[PDB]
Amino acid sequence: EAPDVKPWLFLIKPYEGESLSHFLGRFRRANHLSASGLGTLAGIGAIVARWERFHFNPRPSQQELEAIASVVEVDAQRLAQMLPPAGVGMQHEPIRLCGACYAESPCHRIEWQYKSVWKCDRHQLKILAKCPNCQAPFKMPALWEDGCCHRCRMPFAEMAKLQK
Amino acid sequence: SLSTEATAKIVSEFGRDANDTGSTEVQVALLTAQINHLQGHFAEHKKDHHSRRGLLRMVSQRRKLLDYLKRKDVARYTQLIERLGLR
Amino acid sequence: SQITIQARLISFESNRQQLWKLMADLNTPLINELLCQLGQHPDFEKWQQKGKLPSTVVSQLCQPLKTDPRFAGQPSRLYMSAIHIVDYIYKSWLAIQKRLQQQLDGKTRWLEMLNSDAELVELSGDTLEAIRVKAAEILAIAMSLSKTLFDAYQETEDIKSRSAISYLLKNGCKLTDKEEDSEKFAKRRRQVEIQIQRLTEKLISRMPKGRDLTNAKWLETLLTATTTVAEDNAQAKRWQDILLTRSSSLPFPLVFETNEDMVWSKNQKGRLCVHFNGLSDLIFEVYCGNRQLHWFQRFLEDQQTKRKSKNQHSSGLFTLRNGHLVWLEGEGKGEPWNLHHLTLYCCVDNRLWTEEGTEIVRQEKADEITKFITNMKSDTQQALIQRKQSTLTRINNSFERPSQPLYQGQSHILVGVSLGLEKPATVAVVDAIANKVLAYRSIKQLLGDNYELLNRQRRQQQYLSHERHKAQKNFSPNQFGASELGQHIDRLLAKAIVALARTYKAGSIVLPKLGDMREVVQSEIQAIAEQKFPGYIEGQQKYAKQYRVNVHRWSYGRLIQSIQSKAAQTGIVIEEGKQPIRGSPHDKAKELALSAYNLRL
RNA sequence: UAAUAGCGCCGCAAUUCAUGCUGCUUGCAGCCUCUGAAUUUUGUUAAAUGAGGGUUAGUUUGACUGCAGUCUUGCUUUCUGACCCUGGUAGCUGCUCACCCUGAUGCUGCUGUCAAUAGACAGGAUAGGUGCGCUCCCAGCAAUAAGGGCGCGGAUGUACUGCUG
């Protein structure tokens, strides 16, 4: 039997602005889970495999974010900060990257998917929508395991040099 | 769809250089040429429900290319709208 | 009791073209008078609350449109046809909306009331037995039981002891010892939540749309969308939803609600003819098969009999009741009045055919008119009464008509009809005082020589559904289905069931209270599918497609109507009862008829 | 060559009774010669169902009067028969395709002759697989379900059937 221990997971701390797709992706590498495995563990079923693709057509409800909060140990109000604010239209087709800031914080920021964002203000640089050398489109942010282009294997931190 | 000569004629007039095969001004000029020829047929053969699918795609593509060009460069957008007689 | 018969009308172009021009011009105030209530009218939400249109409002919107430069060219009877149709469009639509509002409330009460056994213990602060004892007291007080229990829950909250009334209601107005599975309860409570959601999605219905023949909105939208740039995705889709819309090719029919507003005659050639009030220049010739001619001769004989008798007989007993004049769609090319086909549909009360049946309608109207006059007891009201008193005296003067003794059945012999998915009908004839089944029929007997047609219907539905899919992917216009075959099979069964009822001298035919089976199944399969594909909504919809589709194709309302019509033409009473959930198709039919007999008192 | 399986129908072989068949006890006994329900089985020049697309104001199902005599109309549909075709050039128009892998409610599948090019000519609803059919299965193709791989120019502030025709 257990040596008097409370039930646990490899919890992770969220970064200052990462997207819910990227955060769930990290959580299911810190713990070795499949997307449907994490959805099953949370009790919300196949829902998680939409959110990793930014398929928020029906948006994440309060009850679904609370279910994930019970697994990932982040409250529903901090999970909501990893999604667009009410009426801020995002686009989920082109995944986009600053890359200059990815050296300061290795994450996909939610703000790069807003229809209103075209340049990163911390660095005053145009946002990328494909690998600057091989023109490949980026994988969904849950899959950013290596932090580099999947085709030509160029680090995202080096794409700082090739933009604007 | 357009004849070979008609495409070559349209890309040579909206292309900014001999290199433009498909800048946003060339792509909107080819969709505009198609839409005009398609409105002259689809208003006559009102029963042709396979051509309404073609028109509604082709108009919706033009609008996306125009909205992109509007934000990218308003001067290029204004000149393109004039040259195509759009409002 | 009513039936509709039909004939094509033939007349030289000038007459078929002049009538088309009046109907293409009349079709337009049929649209403007819907818009004058669709958006213009300020009281509209008061009508949606009451469920009924005020009896004069459409006439008060039409009266000033009679002088409109666009609408002024039409006879007084074509405006009454417009007022009729628009009255019936809203008088239907408001009555659809009111029953949906009533169902949404009538289940919103139940979703609050439906509690698990553990929730009743928490909400009462007491034992589930204390709840069983109070439920036994409530039945003792009560002894319309279900209605009384809902009243006793609305009123009489009684320190939350009405929780025991909810315990009766969820148990079907009975005591239960068993304590329920929370998974079965979760499925049950979820079905109610799904029905509430779907009723709101339905209650938010579209307003009535008129038949715009002009294409003007479509042509304006085409030249807009091709020459201009939308400012929004919503505007670009608003133009798409217009451009995809198929426009109507036929005007609304004329409705002539007064039987005398059709005048009949015999042509020199011996053919029958007709003309309409306000169109008395345009003679039309009747063309119909001899299988229906006897009514069109009767129309002219009813008219001649009144005219030969100085109006001392009333059209209150004319065999014709009302006519609907409609253009049926033709094929190929030509002007609309040369391409389409004038068809006159006559409503006929079939029991006016015979003298013994005419006497029923004489007594029915004489009682209704006597009551109306005594309920009235105004200016023009004085003339309305004189018209009613004059109908009440004239209706006693008989037309010379065919004689046939009325059918009479045994008050103890009933035909039970059981409907289902696999067996569309199955029949048990019961002598209810003997408790003896006189006969049973399964489908192979109940339409005999025609039993190949059920297998044909299932082949044709399956074959044609696949061809329609293949055709849609290619944009072919060829789109066909088994609907007329299903209509024929439902009529073969309706004749055979009533022939069997006559054979055994049955006093009545018994039909099940099936109700809204389609919506019930749709919520049951969804509450279940949500447990097997959680979060994967596309998998939930795919769960039992063939079962849900077969229930949406199940023609039970059309078979129930087909039997009603043929039974009432024969004179056999229709009765109803609860259809058993378990037993064979025969046992269902047996217990259904016996239940309807037990409900006599 | 292949199509073994699965699913839906069609009868055929049985078994069990009745809504049936002999009696009078008007409710029992008795069996399956019929007419019917239920289960199981089967694919034997058994039997029965059997969707390539089209064609007639077609015939019969009708009304009235004592089963005989009068009158009769050509409407809207479902089958069974029979016959015909398996198309022609003159414009307009949608979709699809750089090139590959997976192969979809994807397309194609008859007889004979000439070519053995991908197509003509002459027959034809027997027309890939079984008693008969399918979204199933076999064979060929697969750009015109979808996903993934990925070459060279334009564009590259999110647009990109936008190029390779």
3-class SS string, chain A: CCCCCCCCCCCCCCCCCECHHHHHHHHHHHCCCCHHHHHHHHCCHHHHHHHCCCCCCCCCCHHHHHHHHHHHCCCHHHHHHHCCCCCCCECCCCCCECCCHHHCCCCCEHHHHECCCCEECCCCEECECCCCCCCCCCCCHHHCCCCECCCCCCEHHHCCCCCC
Which three-class secondary structure state does DSSP give residue C265? strand
Chain D bases closer than 7 A to any CB of the protein:
8-10, 19-20, 36-38, 49-51, 53-54, 57, 61-65, 72-79, 92-96, 105-107, 134-135, 145, 149-151, 153-163, 165
Phi and psi at residue C85, in whole multiples of 5°? -55, -50
Interface of A with C in 48-107 (CB under 8 A): 48
Asked if B38 and B55 count as a contact pair (C-beta separation under 8 A), the reply is yes
A126 with A164: CB under 8 angstroms?
yes
Does C215 reach chain B within 8 Å, measured CB to CB?
A: yes
Site from A38, A41, A47 to mutate, C interface, most C CB atoms within 10 angstroms:
A47
Quickly give C241 CA vs D51 C1' distance in Å: 36
- A52 residue type, one letter: E
| Interface of chain C toward chain A, CB-CB under 8 angstroms | 533-536, 539
Q: Can you tell me the distance from the alpha carbon of C9 to that of C11, in angstroms, rounded to the nearest whole number?
A: 7
- Name the nt closest to C270 by C-alpha to C1': D73
How many CA atoms lie less than 13 Å away from C168 in the CB half-sphere?
Answer: 25
**Residue C505, SS3 per DSSP:** coil
Question: Which of C 450-509 lie inside 8 A of B, CB atoms?
Answer: 475, 477
Q: CA triplet A141, A146, A151: central angle to 5 degrees?
A: 85
Residue C208 is encoded by which pair of tokens? 């009535």
Amino acid at A43: G
Q: Which of C226, C228, C473 has the most B C-beta neighbours within 10 Å, making it the best mutation to test the interface with B?
A: C226
Q: How many residues does chain A have?
A: 164
Q: Name the experiment that determined this structure.
A: cryo-EM
Look at residues C546, C548, C542, C550 and name the one whose alpha carbon lies nearest to residue C523.
C548
CB-based contact C229 B56, cutoff 8 Å? no
Closest approach of chain A CAs to the CA of C533, in angstroms? 8
* DSSP label of B86: -
Specify which residues C323 forms β-bridges with.
Answer: C256, C346
Terminus-to-terminus CA distance in chain A, angstroms?
59
**Nucleotide of closest approach to C273 (CA, C1'):** D73
How many Cβ atoms are within 10 Å of B21's Cβ, its own excluded? 9
Q: Are C270 and C309 in contact (CB under 8 A)?
A: no
The end-to-end CA distance of chain C, in Å, is 26
CB contact under 8 A, C533 and A46: yes
Query: What whole-number distance in Å separates Cα of residue A140 and Cα of residue A22?
Result: 8
Q: Which of C548, C425, C564 is nearest to C486 (CA)?
A: C425
| Separation between Cα atoms, residue C34 and residue C39, nearest integer Å | 9
Contacts of B60 in chain C (CB under 8 A): 236, 240
- Residue C349: partners with Cβ closer than 8 Å, 6 or more residues away: C1, C2, C319, C321, C361
Dist CA C487 CA C555 (whole Å): 9
* Rounded Cα distance, A100 and A122, in Å: 9
Q: Which residue has the tokens 């509450």?
A: C527
Report helix, strand or coil for B73: coil
Distance from CA of C539 to the nearest CA of A (A): 10
Are residues C225 and B59, on separate chains, in Cβ contact within 8 Å?
yes
Residue A128 backbone phi and psi in degrees, to 5: -85, 145
Query: Which tokens is C597 given?
Result: 């007999």
Chain A residues with CB inside 8 Å of C539's CB?
46
> Gap from C484 CA to D77 C1', in Å?
7
Shortest CB distance from B86 goes to which of C227, C236, C475? C227
CB C7 within 8 A of CB C286: yes
Asked if C261 and C277 count as a contact pair (C-beta separation under 8 A), the reply is yes
Structure tokens at C271: 């053919």
Alpha-helix runs per DSSP H in C377-503:
379-394, 443-446, 452-473, 483-503
- How far apart are the C-alpha atoms of C298 and A159, rounded to whole Å? 93
Distance A144 CA to D90 C1' (A): 60
Classify strands C262-266 and C341-349 as parallel, antiparallel or unpaired.
unpaired
For C434-454, give one letter per residue: b (16+ CB within 10 A) or e.
eeebbebbebeebbeeeeebb
- Rg of chain C over Cα atoms, rounded to whole angstroms, equals 29
Any residues with CB less than 8 A from the CB of C430 and at least 6 apart, and which? C413, C414, C416, C436, C437, C438, C590, C593, C594, C597
Q: Is A134 annotated as a binding residue?
A: yes
CB C236 within 8 A of CB C271: no
Q: Which residues contact C285 (CB under 8 A, 6 or more apart)?
A: C9, C10, C11, C267, C271, C272, C273
Half-sphere exposure of B60 (CA within 13 A, CB side): 16
Is residue C93 within 8 A of residue C208, CB to CB? The reply is yes
**Alpha helical stretches, state H, C277-339:** 293-307, 336-339
Tell me which chain C residue has its CA closest to the CA of residue A47.
C535
* Distance between CA atoms of residues C347 and C283, nearest Å: 21
Q: Which nucleotide shows the minimum CA-to-C1' distance to residue B31?
A: D162
Map C277-292 to HEC letters. Answer: CCCCCCCEEEECCCCC
Domain range for B77? 1-87
Residues of A in contact with C535 (CB under 8 A): 39, 44-48
Closest C-alpha to C597, from C438, C441, C434, C426 = C434
CB neighbourhood size of C294 (10 A): 11
How far away is chain B from the Cα of C468, in angstroms, using its nearest Cα?
16
Which string of DSSP letters, residue by residue, matches C395-416?
A: TTS-------PPP--EEEEEEE
In 3D space, the residue among C481, C488, C497, C420 whose CA is nearest the CA of residue C454 turns out to be C488
Q: Which nucleotide is nearest to A114 (CA to C1')?
A: D158
Task: Please compute Rg for chain B using Cα positions.
Answer: 14
Task: State the amino acid at position C68 in one-letter form.
Answer: D
List the chains bordering chain B where 3 or more Cβ pairs fall under 8 Å.
C
Residue A98 marked ligand-binding: yes
Q: Name the minimum distance, in Å, from the CA of C551 to any CA of chain A.
A: 29
Q: Kindly report the backbone phi and psi dihedral angles of residue A125, in degrees, each rounded to the nearest multiple of 5, phi listed first.
A: -115, 140
What is the DSSP pairing of strand C506-512 with strand C573-577? parallel
In which order are the strands placed within the sheet that holds C262-266? C254-256, C320-328, C341-349, C2-10, C284-287, C272-276, C262-266
Domain count, chain B: 1
